[PDB]
Design an enzyme around this catalytic site. Structure first.
Site, PDB file in Angstrom:
ATOM      1  N   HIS A 152      18.145  -8.561  36.587  1.00 12.58           N
ATOM      2  CA  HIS A 152      17.529  -7.400  37.210  1.00 12.58           C
ATOM      3  C   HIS A 152      16.840  -6.563  36.165  1.00 12.58           C
ATOM      4  O   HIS A 152      16.478  -5.421  36.425  1.00 12.58           O
ATOM      5  CB  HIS A 152      18.535  -6.540  37.953  1.00 12.58           C
ATOM      6  CG  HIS A 152      19.304  -7.392  38.872  1.00 12.58           C
ATOM      7  ND1 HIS A 152      20.382  -8.108  38.453  1.00 12.58           N
ATOM      8  CD2 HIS A 152      19.076  -7.750  40.142  1.00 12.58           C
ATOM      9  CE1 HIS A 152      20.831  -8.825  39.454  1.00 12.58           C
ATOM     10  NE2 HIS A 152      20.049  -8.636  40.494  1.00 12.58           N
TER      11      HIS A 152
HETATM   12  O1  LIG Z   1      20.290 -11.360  41.244  1.00 13.32           O
HETATM   13  C1  LIG Z   1      20.362 -11.976  42.214  1.00 13.32           C
HETATM   14  C2  LIG Z   1      20.377 -11.390  43.553  1.00 13.32           C
HETATM   15  O2  LIG Z   1      20.252 -10.101  43.672  1.00 13.32           O
HETATM   16  C3  LIG Z   1      20.496 -12.094  44.789  1.00 13.32           C
HETATM   17  C4  LIG Z   1      20.451 -11.058  45.918  1.00 13.32           C
HETATM   18  C5  LIG Z   1      19.261 -11.020  46.930  1.00 13.32           C
HETATM   19  C6  LIG Z   1      19.604 -10.882  48.451  1.00 13.32           C
HETATM   20  C7  LIG Z   1      20.964 -10.050  48.542  1.00 13.32           C
HETATM   21  C8  LIG Z   1      21.420  -9.556  49.940  1.00 13.32           C
HETATM   22  C9  LIG Z   1      20.412  -9.254  50.858  1.00 13.32           C
HETATM   23  C10 LIG Z   1      20.772  -8.760  52.078  1.00 13.32           C
HETATM   24  C11 LIG Z   1      22.138  -8.608  52.352  1.00 13.32           C
HETATM   25 CL1  LIG Z   1      22.543  -7.981  53.970  1.00 13.32          CL
HETATM   26  C12 LIG Z   1      23.163  -8.877  51.445  1.00 13.32           C
HETATM   27  C13 LIG Z   1      22.796  -9.372  50.203  1.00 13.32           C
HETATM   28  C14 LIG Z   1      22.076 -10.784  47.928  1.00 13.32           C
HETATM   29  C15 LIG Z   1      21.893 -10.735  46.409  1.00 13.32           C
HETATM   30  C16 LIG Z   1      20.639 -13.511  44.739  1.00 13.32           C
HETATM   31  O3  LIG Z   1      20.718 -14.209  45.694  1.00 13.32           O
HETATM   32  C17 LIG Z   1      20.575 -14.174  43.370  1.00 13.32           C
HETATM   33  C18 LIG Z   1      20.722 -15.541  43.392  1.00 13.32           C
HETATM   34  C19 LIG Z   1      20.761 -16.164  42.109  1.00 13.32           C
HETATM   35  C20 LIG Z   1      20.702 -15.452  40.877  1.00 13.32           C
HETATM   36  C21 LIG Z   1      20.561 -14.066  40.896  1.00 13.32           C
HETATM   37  C22 LIG Z   1      20.515 -13.457  42.169  1.00 13.32           C
HETATM   38  S1  FES Z   2      20.501  -6.700  35.090  1.00  7.81           S
HETATM   39 FE1  FES Z   2      21.391  -6.850  37.114  1.00  7.81          FE
HETATM   40  S2  FES Z   2      22.545  -8.573  36.416  1.00  7.81           S
HETATM   41 FE2  FES Z   2      22.290  -7.808  34.422  1.00  7.81          FE
END
Ligand SMILES: O=C1C(O)=C([C@H]2CC[C@@H](c3ccc(Cl)cc3)CC2)C(=O)c2ccccc21
Ligand code: FES
Ligand SMILES: CCCCCCCCCCCCCCCCCC(=O)OC[C@H](COP(=O)([O-])OCC(O)COP(=O)([O-])OC[C@@H](COC(=O)CCCCCCCCCCCCCCCCC)OC(=O)CCCCCCCCCCCCCCCCC)OC(=O)CCCCCCCCCCCCCCCCC
Ligand SMILES: CCCCCCCCCCCCCCCCCC(=O)OC[C@H](COP(=O)([O-])OCC(O)COP(=O)([O-])OC[C@@H](COC(=O)CCCCCCCCCCCCCCCCC)OC(=O)CCCCCCCCCCCCCCCCC)OC(=O)CCCCCCCCCCCCCCCCC
Ligand SMILES: CCCCCCCCCCCCCCCCCC(=O)OC[C@H](COP(=O)([O-])OCC[N+](C)(C)C)OC(=O)CCCCCCCCCCCCCCCCC
Ligand SMILES: CCCCCCCCCCCCCCCCCC(=O)OC[C@H](COP(=O)([O-])OCC[N+](C)(C)C)OC(=O)CCCCCCCCCCCCCCCCC
Ligand code: HEM
Ligand code: HEM
Ligand code: HEM
Ligand SMILES: CCCCCC[C@H]1C(=O)O[C@H](C)[C@H](NC(=O)c2cccc(NC=O)c2O)C(=O)O[C@@H](C)[C@@H]1OC(=O)CC(C)C
Ligand SMILES: CCCCCC[C@H]1C(=O)O[C@H](C)[C@H](NC(=O)c2cccc(NC=O)c2O)C(=O)O[C@@H](C)[C@@H]1OC(=O)CC(C)C
Ligand SMILES: CCCCCCCCCCCCO[C@@H]1O[C@H](CO)[C@@H](O[C@H]2O[C@H](CO)[C@@H](O)[C@H](O)[C@H]2O)[C@H](O)[C@H]1O
Ligand SMILES: CCCCCCCCCCCCO[C@@H]1O[C@H](CO)[C@@H](O[C@H]2O[C@H](CO)[C@@H](O)[C@H](O)[C@H]2O)[C@H](O)[C@H]1O
Lengths: 186, 54, 85, 75, 124, 383, 55, 124
Positions: A152
């Site tokens: 992020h």
């Molecule tokens: O940093 C992230 C990230 O933030 C999400 C996210 C995006 C959607 C999110 C989410 C969206 C909507 C709901 Cl209701 C709940 C979770 C879940 C976390 C991922 O899926 C991800 C997968 C693989 C590596 C890093 C990541």
């Molecule tokens: S910056 Fe969100 S995971 Fe480290």
């Protein structure tokens, strides 16, 4: 038999004190006791049952990882696994330490100086998990040229202090001791 | 006795609060009471009873 | 709010005569050429601005941002990138 | 002689008015206690809850100060 | 939102000379582009009716107006599914776009809001 | 009386798939409901089949997926079908929620199916995610880490919950096995909720593209919509076939074909195409708790559409201004999607924030305002 | 009309577990139905839990 | 099985002197041990009524007989749930165990079986 105004005999069942508060209260004491044992039982059931998901005995096994330092050249960061989490060990140069000691502590989400973080200025030892959501920052990248979490976009410093991005805390420092000057245990 | 009904039982909010607080008390005291009882019936058997040798 | 066949909950209907013909009696593709060309053009024209305006605006915004981003990471964009960070 | 009945409309919203809601304020209080007691009871097992809440309670708090002797602790 | 709200606010606008001068032409264009007249609807045919209040207003319609409403909705449903528009006499002309329902719903809601108000009266 | 009406069991089926009275003018956007049903059936069939071949243990999981690809007869098909249908499920569900927002399906009397729907949408996200993790490739492990750390946002207890959901100090074997259990389970819960939102809808019946009552003109669900739904079944299967057979990896991330290495996370972290909008939201907000709240709120805020739409008219067919606002909202949601997959760099950091504000301002400001103004324009404009 | 009767979802629950009219003289052998329901709930809870740990 | 079957077969038995001599005493003890009279039931109260035919027969009962049947079933249900037996006047005496329903169901079934037969007639 015939009259519907002659209520059938209920005397075998009727309580004389039926309209007292003591009478209601007794029944509610029973219902409340049953609620109390149900609540104690529910809590015990849920607590014991859900604990299965907490780390099992085999997982709870501590590492005490020892690492050499002779191997590590100046201006490099290693990654030692310790409890599955990576440990960044950086052999910081003199000018890197200087760069770290510069930033006014005032303007730092998590205000700490390098002195608080390292116990030896030449060995930045950190739990290399980003304090935001838990990726492992890519070292040497960033904007504060320390570490950059690619997930992020949070930037850590050469002290491993957070400078930009969502991460709230600086990269955690494990409990580490220099047993020798050339080996540390974590 | 009316008073006790009025305070702890009449309002369901109060009755449920009383039941959960009683469950808390029961849960803590029952645990402690069974622990002591279990140690008395299995006296000298359990690790805590032979641990002192080591 | 909706009933079922027989008591659907329509306000009382009177005076509508509905007529249709059997699927076997009708050409299912009658006037398909006319519809496919002239009717679809009509319906597309009438809705075009509701798609074109937001797509064109957000494509412009994306285009500007992606061109700036590209430029910031060139040699020429060194200084502007240093300011941005 | 009275020419018109003497009244106001109290402010109301979604059929709640302040007179009525004020009578229920105590009850939310008790239900909040019930939710507090109940929630805290549910997480009494959580080590953080003992460490940070329950062991701090005077007199009673010693119930949750338990150390496993290091002789019996593999971890 | 309630029809009462919409009607009172509209009346505030039509009162203010400045406001009407700038809003009435906007609203007339909006209605032309809305294009409900091209399916032969009157504006009021489009008001959400799945509400206690509206069901009551629709039950109050004179049989004539009620039957015609059913017809316009049936006819519009048929235009919709055929992806055709009204032509000729089926197009609602501005002069035929009468607020047949507004008086009925305003009466329904007037009573409903009075009822809510009087449920909250305080003897002084 | 017809058996289909007499017999209690048949009568329930009858009421849903045969005699169900539907408006006569539903357009093709009413077909997503049945496509989501078809996706759900495909996912159950391929999913249960993969579960017969997949091993949940972290030492074997990735390898069992390779074994599925390589050794199991038609394993490649079953795996890619499962993976691709998960993408199609999201196209269809955004389409279906799109349809519902455009035609005001969330308004009374359909607030309940809408609100149950919002929960189905959350469950789909959690199901599809839990399923993503089971591959235990690089993205899988990292995704697990992040999702299980969203509860760290929750103060005090948060960190302990994280450890409890991992069953460890990190994502590892325990986590993968519990994700398998729950990924198998979650779809059946989702099918319950899908059924429930239909049962909730059955009181009001489907909305229609005009937003008027359809009580005046109903059509039996079969044969009309049964045969109408086949057109999209076959159109869906055509698109499914093009992905599954011809480009099975177009919708995938290469990094998931690298086994999980807890020591590195890939420099290019980009989640599934369908989570990208909320991921960009999470990136936009620079606070931990903030970022998480915003991301969840982006879904939960759909729950307030019934309140904030102040229109006296159901849906957007007849509201030029609302249609334009909806167009910008949809395009902004696609822009968020796009910004979810660029690098976290200027100028997209500021852009992502602006898009995040616009996303929320649609529900909180613009929709309430525009819907109020259009009410007035209808009344004044028709006098 | 009572919410439990008005609301379609609640009305289905209501019809099964609350207002459902039962004969007044069912003896203890009518209790196995709910025990089988309880077994089924226990089995789902413990089963899904074992599935989180079983390979 | 149909009540008609049971009644005709019973009549075959009562006709045959030998058969009745051995069966009537058996059936009378069977009924004593059955013990439905101890819940104040008449035999006919126990006939399965959740069929079309029986519903029709029960609708044909005279109001008095029908009301009394409801009472005996209510009373027996109450004995059952209390795990008590009838006492005194509630016990069905053999003289009160009248086949109040058999004539009605036999008429219902007679017609139903004639209907089935005549649905299968062949003009010769
Ligand atoms: O940093 C992230 C990230 O933030 C999400 C996210 C995006 C959607 C999110 C989410 C969206 C909507 C709901 Cl209701 C709940 C979770 C879940 C976390 C991922 O899926 C991800 C997968 C693989 C590596 C890093 C990541
Ligand atoms: S910056 Fe969100 S995971 Fe480290
Ligand atoms: C995914 C899985 C695959 C399955 C396929 C399902 C997709 C089908 C669907 O829902 O869309 C088809 C759908 C056809 O559905 P329809 O029932 O004929 O009319 C639906 C519209 O409400 C009717 O809208 P209309 O009558 O206003 O017609 C509008 C449409 C013209 O519609 C056409 O048919 C073309 O034209 C446009 O809006 C295009 C914009 C201009 C581009 C320059 O196409 C569209 O209208 C898409 C417009 C979206 C923007
Ligand atoms: C497995 C999981 C554990 C949960 C417990 C569930 C078991 C409950 C159950 O259904 O049985 C209790 C059940 C009590 O049920 P109830 O509602 O009092 O009467 C049901 C019958 O109508 C009771 O028939 P009754 O009114 O004719 O009374 C008969 C019963 C006496 O019934 C009792 O009250 C005992 O005495 C016997 O038949 C015992 C046989 C004599 C051998 C010496 O006991 C029996 O009926 C046992 C007899 C079975 C042969
Ligand atoms: C399994 C979970 C067990 C939780 C129950 C714990 C507390 C609730 C309880 O005892 O219910 C009593 C209460 C009260 O029982 P009650 O409804 O008979 O008493 C109402 C009458 N007064 C308030 C005057 C006493 O029941 C509930 O509120 C229903 C919740 C039960 C689940
Ligand atoms: C991309 C931009 C979207 C703009 C849509 C504006 C309306 C339009 O022209 O569409 C054609 C048609 C117009 O149909 P309509 O029913 O308004 O009009 C039919 C014709 N009249 C008016 C004469 C009755 O709209 C639709 O069918 C829209 C369905 C919306 C689906 C959105 C999916 C996006 C997913 C995001 C989820 C969050
Ligand atoms: C597993 C996912 C889902 C399935 C299988 C499903 C299925 C369906 C079906 C078959 C219908 C009726 C036909 C149709 O209108 O398309 C429908 C209607 C509806 N669905 Fe869904 N749905 C799902 C998810 C959702 C979600 C996520 C929402 C809302 C966020 C939603 C909200 C609705 C609403 C409001 C309706 C009524 C719409 C109307 O007919 O006007 N559904 N759904
Ligand atoms: C909504 C229903 C479902 C969705 C949205 C869904 C989604 C997914 C996704 C995205 C993956 C990652 C696929 C990949 O990239 O390889 C996956 C994997 C998996 N799913 Fe599902 N799934 C669903 C239902 C099920 C069901 C019911 C099962 C039954 C067990 C199941 C079993 C699996 C298994 C075993 C895997 C891992 C093997 C693999 O990656 O292919 N899924 N699922
Ligand atoms: C009617 C429901 C169920 C019945 C009758 C049932 C029965 C059983 C039985 C007899 C075993 C052998 C247990 C043993 O001797 O160790 C077992 C094992 C197992 N069951 Fe179930 N089960 C049920 C539901 C479930 C469900 C829903 C799951 C969800 C996964 C599940 C997961 C397991 C697992 C993982 C094992 C193997 C681990 C073990 O043996 O304990 N079961 N089940
Ligand atoms: C077999 C009986 C069991 C009842 C449930 C089975 C499914 C069921 O009811 O099917 C129907 C065909 C339904 N469609 C519609 O309502 C529908 C209504 C109007 C227009 C159209 N199309 C337009 O052009 C429709 O398609 C549908 O697809 O909904 C599934 C999701 C249902 O699955 C479930 O909820 C259970 C589980 C599998 C999700
Ligand atoms: C919650 C909404 C879904 C509705 C289904 C939920 C359950 C439901 O219907 O509960 C009722 C309480 C039912 N018992 C009776 O009818 C009942 C009737 C007469 C006498 C007694 N006892 C006598 O002394 C009874 O116990 C029961 O135990 O049946 C479970 C099996 C049901 O679960 C399911 O089918 C789903 C799944 C868990 C099996
Ligand atoms: C919505 C519900 C709220 C969240 C639910 C909480 C789930 C997890 C909470 C507690 C689980 C672990 O918490 C822990 O529980 C176990 C029992 O399971 C307790 O363990 C105690 O009792 C067990 C038997 O009961 C013994 O084997 C153990 O030696 C003893 O210490 C711990 O004293 C408690 O710290
Ligand atoms: C645990 C997962 C199960 C989830 C499903 C949830 C509910 C369980 C069964 C619902 C399916 C059938 O339930 C359906 O509901 C209606 C309306 O309440 C019921 O209808 C019943 O009650 C209504 C009113 O209370 C009466 O008019 C009717 O005579 C009676 O049959 C039927 O029993 C059934 O047709």
């Amino acid at each position: 038999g015939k009259s519907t105004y002659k209520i059938p005999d209920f005397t075998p069942y009727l309580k004389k004190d039926r309209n007292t508060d003591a009478n209601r209260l007794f029944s509610y004491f029973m219902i409340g006791s049953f609620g109390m044992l149900s609540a104690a039982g529910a809590k015990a059931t849920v607590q014991d049952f859900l604990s299965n998901m907490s780390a099992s005995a085999d997982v709870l096994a501590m590492a005490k990882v020892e690492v050499k330092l002779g191997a590590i050249p100046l201006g490099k960061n290693v990654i030692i696994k310790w409890r599955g989490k990576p440990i960044f060990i950086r052999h910081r140069t003199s000018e890197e330490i200087e760069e770290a000691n510069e930033v006014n502590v005032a303007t730092l989400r998590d205000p700490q100086t390098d002195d608080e973080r390292v116990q030896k200025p030449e060995w930045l030892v950190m739990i290399g998990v980003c304090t935001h959501l838990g990726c492992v920052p890519i070292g040497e990248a960033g904007d504060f040229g320390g570490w950059f979490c690619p997930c992020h976009g949070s930037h850590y410093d050469i002290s491993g202090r957070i400078r930009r991005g969502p991460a709230p805390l600086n990269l955690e420092i494990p409990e580490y001791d220099f047993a020798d000057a050339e080996t540390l245990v974590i | 006795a009316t008073t006790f009904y009025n305070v702890f039982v009449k309002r369901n909010s109060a009755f449920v609060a009383t039941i959960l607080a009683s469950a808390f008390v029961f849960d803590m005291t029952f645990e402690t009471a069974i622990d002591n009882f279990w140690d008395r019936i299995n006296a000298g058997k359990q690790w805590k009873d032979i641990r002192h040798k080591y | 709010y909706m009933g079922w066949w027989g008591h659907m909950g329509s306000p009382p209907q009177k005076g509508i005569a509905g007529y249709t013909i059997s699927p076997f009696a009708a050409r299912p593709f009658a006037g398909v050429v006319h519809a496919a060309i002239f009717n679809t053009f009509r319906r597309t024209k009438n809705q075009a601005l509701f798609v074109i305006l937001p797509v064109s605006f957000f494509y412009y915004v994306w285009t500007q941002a992606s061109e700036k981003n590209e430029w910031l990471y060139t040699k020429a964009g060194r200084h502007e990138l240093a300011k941005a960070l | 002689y009275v020419k018109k009945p003497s009244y106001k409309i109290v402010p109301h919203f979604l059929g709640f008015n302040i007179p009525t809601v004020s009578k229920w304020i105590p009850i939310f209080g008790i239900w909040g206690a019930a939710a507090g007691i109940g929630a805290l009871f549910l997480i009494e097992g959580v080590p953080r809850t003992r460490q940070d809440i329950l062991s701090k309670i005077p007199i009673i708090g010693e119930h949750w100060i338990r150390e496993i002797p290091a002789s019996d602790n593999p971890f | 939102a309630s029809i009462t709200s919409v009607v009172k606010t509209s009346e505030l606008i039509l009162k203010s000379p400045l406001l009407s001068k700038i809003v009435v032409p906007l609203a007339k264009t909006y209605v032309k582009f809305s294009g409900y007249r091209q399916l032969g609807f009157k504006m009021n045919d489009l008001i959400i009716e799945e509400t206690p209040n509206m069901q009551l207003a629709l039950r109050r319609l004179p049989p004539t107006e009620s039957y015609d409403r059913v017809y316009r909705l049936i006819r519009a449903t048929q235009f919709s599914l055929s992806h055709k528009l009204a032509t000729g006499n089926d197009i609602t002309k501005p002069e035929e776009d009468d607020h047949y329902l507004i008086p009925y719903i305003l009466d329904v809601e007037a009573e409903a809001f009075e009822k809510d108000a009087l449920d909250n009266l305080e003897v002084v | 009386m017809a058996l289909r009406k007499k017999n209690s069991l048949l009568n329930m089926a009858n009421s849903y798939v045969l005699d169900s009275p539907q408006p006569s003018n539903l357009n093709y956007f009413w077909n997503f409901g049945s496509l989501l049903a078809l996706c759900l059936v495909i996912q159950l069939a391929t999913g249960i089949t993969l579960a017969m071949h997949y091993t949940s243990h972290a030492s074997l999981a990735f390898d069992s997926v390779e074994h599925i690809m390589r050794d199991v007869n038609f394993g490649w098909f079953i795996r890619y079908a499962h993976a691709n249908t998960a993408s199609f499920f999201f196209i269809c569900i955004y389409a279906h929620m799109g349809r519902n927002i455009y035609y005001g399906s969330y308004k009374t009397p359909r607030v309940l199916p809408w609100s149950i729907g919002v929960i189905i949408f959350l469950l789909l996200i959690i199901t599809a995610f839990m399923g993503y993790v089971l591959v235990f490739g690089q993205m899988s492990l990292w995704g697990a880490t992040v999702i299980c750390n969203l509860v760290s946002a929750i103060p005090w207890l948060g960190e302990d919950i994280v450890h409890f959901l991992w069953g460890g100090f990190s994502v590892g074997n325990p986590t993968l096995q519990r994700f398998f259990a729950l990924h198998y389970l979650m779809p059946f819960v989702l099918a319950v909720f899908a059924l429930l939102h239909l049962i909730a809808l059955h009181t009001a019946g489907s909305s229609n593209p005009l937003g008027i009552t359809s009580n005046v003109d109903k059509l039996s669900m079969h044969p009309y919509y049964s045969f109408k739904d086949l057109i999209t079944v076959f159109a869906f299967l055509l698109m499914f076939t093009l992905f599954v057979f011809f480009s099975p990896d177009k919708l995938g991330h290469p990094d998931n074909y690298i086994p999980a290495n807890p020591m590195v996370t890939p420099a290019s972290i980009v989640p599934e195409w369908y989570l990208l909008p909320f991921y960009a939201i999470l990136r936009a907000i620079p606070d931990k708790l903030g970022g998480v709240i915003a991301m969840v709120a982006a879904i939960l805020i759909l729950l307030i559409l019934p309140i904030v739409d102040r229109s006296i008219i159901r849906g957007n067919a007849f509201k030029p201004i609302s249609k334009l606002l909806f167009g910008f909202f949809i395009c902004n949601f696609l822009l968020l999607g796009v910004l979810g997959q660029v690098h976290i760099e200027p100028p997209f950091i500021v852009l992502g924030q602006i898009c995040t504000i616009f996303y929320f301002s649609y529900f909180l400001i613009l929709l309430p305002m525009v819907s109020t103004i259009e009410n007035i324009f209808f009344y004044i404009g028709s006098l």
